[PDB]
């Protein structure tokens, strides 16, 4: 599914992402916009042969199992395909472990390069939260 900005904003907050580990909701929404264009079905292959999955482009090298990333970890204990669902629960729960893993939201390259330092509140503006 392709989310609306405010719609995703609401599901994200419902799922406890607002101020999770100090990151206001607009950070999460901004990362999703640039990672996936709010498309839960986004996949992208990395040069190392791992694949990024879903709304938050979660990487198969560390976080989910896709059976074709030799010698990878599945730290979120999920099939990568679960990160492609119209329900973002899987993506959120896994995102929760990623942002706790020590580098915070910097784990998301598009967040670091496109959201970090910008007015991310602009991403939840006008939304009925």
UniProtKB/Swiss-Prot annotation:
Subunit details: Monomer.
Any one GO molecular-function label of the UniProt entry: identical protein binding
Tissues and organs where the protein is expressed, per its UniProt entry: In the egg white and polymorphonuclear leukocytes.
Binding locations of substrate: 101
Cellular compartment(s): Secreted
Species whose genome carries this gene: Gallus gallus (Chicken)
Protein name: Lysozyme C
PANTHER family: LYSOZYME C
Gene: LYZ
Top enzyme category: hydrolase
Miscellaneous comment in the UniProt entry for this protein: Lysozyme C is capable of both hydrolysis and transglycosylation; it also shows a slight esterase activity. It acts rapidly on both peptide-substituted and unsubstituted peptidoglycan, and slowly on chitin oligosaccharides.
InterPro entries linked to this entry: Glyco_hydro_22, Glyco_hydro_22_CS, Glyco_hydro_22_lys, Lysozyme-like_dom_sf
Upper lineage: Eukaryota, Metazoa, Chordata, Craniata, Vertebrata
Protein family membership: Belongs to the glycosyl hydrolase 22 family.
């Amino acid at each position: 599914k392709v989310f609306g900005r405010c719609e995703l904003a609401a599901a994200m907050k419902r799922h406890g992402l607002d101020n999770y580990r100090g990151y206001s909701l607009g950070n999460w929404v901004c990362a999703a916009k640039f990672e996936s264009n709010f498309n839960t079905q986004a996949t992208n292959r990395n040069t190392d042969g791992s694949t990024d999955y879903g709304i938050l482009q979660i990487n198969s090298r560390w976080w989910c199992n896709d059976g074709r990333t030799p010698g990878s970890r599945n730290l979120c204990n999920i099939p990568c395909s679960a990160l492609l669902s119209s329900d973002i629960t899987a993506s959120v729960n896994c995102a929760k472990k990623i942002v706790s893993d020590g580098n915070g939201m910097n784990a998301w390259v598009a967040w670091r390069n496109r959201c970090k330092g910008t007015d991310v509140q602009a991403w939840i503006r006008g939304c009925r939260l």
